[PDB]
């Protein structure tokens, strides 16, 4: 088994659609994050949200390949990260670039309590072919990092309570049953949309350290605080990493 590089680290991924709600959603989340700073050492990673859909719409209309779209969407996650970091600047928090996250996170988390980065992985023009939509997005990037570091946890902060049997905002609203607990293998066998990347389920299958990931609703204050303490307030996804 590989060693844990930063065993004391907590990684939090904030969905781009949470950021897309603006001040109504960001201000209570910022206030909750401020209160968490003295409790944990955090790597906060942001997703892309709706602006990545607009750039996919233009990019696909121009016929651009999947490797062209990947860095364009990643830029949106980076911009959400600069917005979130600016809101926490007075607390000593800043946005750090991917090379800094990859090689110097330890020194940055010694200087301050949290840093913000883009959750997108730097696959760029070397994105895998197959789909016209880049498969390695924000949930996948956040998990790859969390598992590579051997982090204490990974929490995914969404605009929904967790994973449902169908899209709770889609045509099948009435058939959507909440799943309090699931496994990566069980979700992989399912058809239908998910609020997490499908590639996340693939990387969870080969995970070395992270045993569970929780998907929580960032629109309900207190849920992120509770999830970071291990409380069951959303959907728990078991990765298939067996403990001792």
């Amino acid at each position: 088994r590989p060693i844990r590089l930063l065993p004391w680290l907590q990684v939090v991924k904030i969905g781009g659609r949470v950021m897309d709600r603006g001040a109504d959603a960001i201000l209570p989340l910022v206030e909750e994050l401020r209160k968490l700073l003295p409790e944990h050492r955090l790597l906060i990673l942001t997703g892309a949200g709706v602006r990545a859909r607009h750039v996919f719409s233009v990019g696909l209309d121009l016929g651009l390949p999947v490797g062209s779209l990947a860095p364009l969407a990643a830029s949106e996650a980076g911009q959400n990260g600069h917005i979130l970091a600016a809101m926490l600047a007075s607390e000593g928090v800043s946005y750090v670039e991917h090379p800094t996250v990859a090689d110097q996170l330890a020194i940055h988390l010694s200087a301050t309590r949290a840093v913000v980065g883009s959750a997108f992985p730097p696959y760029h023009h070397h994105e895998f072919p197959g789909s016209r939509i880049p498969p390695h997005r924000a949930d996948t990037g956040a998990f790859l990092l969390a598992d590579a570091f051997g982090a204490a946890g990974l929490t995914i902060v969404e605009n929904v309570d967790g994973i449902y049997t169908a899209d709770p905002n889609g045509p099948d609203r009435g058939q959507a049953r909440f799943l309090p607990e699931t496994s990566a293998t069980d979700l992989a066998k399912s058809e239908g949309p998910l609020p997490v990347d499908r590639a996340l389920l693939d990387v969870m299958a080969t995970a070395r350290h992270i045993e569970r990931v929780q998907v929580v609703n960032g629109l309900v204050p207190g849920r992120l605080t509770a999830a970071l303490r291990g409380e069951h307030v959303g959907t728990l996804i078991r990765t298939g990493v067996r403990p001792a």
């Binding site: 209309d61 121009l62 070397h126 072919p129 590579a148 080969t206």
Partner: protein, 267 residues
């Protein structure tokens, strides 16, 4: 039309099968359709020094007169030494991937210095190195073949060796830029039924599909096995050619359409 796709992109999750099906109907633009991507093996060629590299440099200089080339370098023995040191410490695949990149960069630097007097640069962003690729006096670029994944490298099912190395790095670039050909320059004539350095009665295979290679359970480490799965999902590069770069004129012959070596097809 594009009206349904734009509506689906706004309202559905990107994991939605309906959205995925609609995005698959989008037009297909090839960025560099006239270019050929070549991978110069690290262990198989560059590590052999002058006897292997100097004849290939002459072929590249002659070939660029008629073919637009993107030349990627492998990593080789210094990367294997770094991987064994780091694996022994229990460092994850993501750390090993960064160490391996440095070795491919050293190899691109050495090759670039032999090619500088012929106008061929070492670049970052080969596929978009529009100026050198548009000039008849240049028509080629050298790049480091390692993918940029670094700490975000997808690990293998077991072990810490990065599964996507310089064969995958060069292939994905050929694929993303919609190149017309992908040639792997190694030190074996091509694929054999058994290992050519081990078994005695291993037969040569001139052409094979990824499915047949999997079905026949081939013990040939000539190509990184994850490259075969990438080849099956590829939109632009549906076949690759493996040639022996130690045979004089083999790269020139492959660029001329000769069926030297093995052709691996997606289907």
């Amino acid at each position: 039309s594009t009206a349904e796709l734009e509506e689906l992109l706004m309202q559905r999750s990107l994991t939605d099968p309906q959205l995925q099906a609609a995005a698959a109907a989008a037009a297909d633009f090839r960025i560099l359709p006239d270019a050929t991507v070549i991978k110069i093996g690290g262990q198989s060629v560059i590590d052999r020094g002058r006897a292997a590299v100097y004849p290939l440099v002459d072929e590249i200089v002659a070939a660029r007169k008629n073919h637009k080339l993107l030349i990627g370098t492998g990593a080789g023995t210094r990367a294997r030494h770094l991987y064994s040191i780091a694996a022994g410490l229990g460092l994850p695949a993501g750390v090993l991937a960064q160490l391996g990149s440095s070795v491919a960069d050293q190899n691109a630097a050495m090759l670039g210095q032999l090619l500088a007097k012929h106008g061929i640069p070492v670049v970052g962003g080969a596929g978009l190195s529009a100026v050198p690729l548009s000039l008849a006096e240049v028509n080629a670029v050298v790049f480091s073949g390692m993918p940029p994944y670094k700490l975000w490298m997808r690990p293998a099912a077991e072990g810490v060796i990065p599964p996507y190395r310089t064969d995958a790095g060069c292939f994905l670039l050929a694929e993303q830029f919609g190149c017309k050909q992908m040639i792997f320059v190694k030190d074996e004539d091509g694929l054999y039924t058994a290992n050519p350095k081990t078994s005695k009665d291993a037969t040569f295979i001139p052409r094979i599909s990824v499915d047949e290679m999997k079905a026949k359970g081939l013990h040939d480490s000539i190509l990184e096995f994850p490259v075969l799965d990438l080849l099956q999902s590829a939109q632009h590069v549906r076949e690759v050619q493996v040639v022996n770069g130690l045979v004089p004129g083999n790269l020139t012959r492959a660029l001329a359409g000769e069926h030297v070596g093995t052709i691996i097809t997606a289907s």
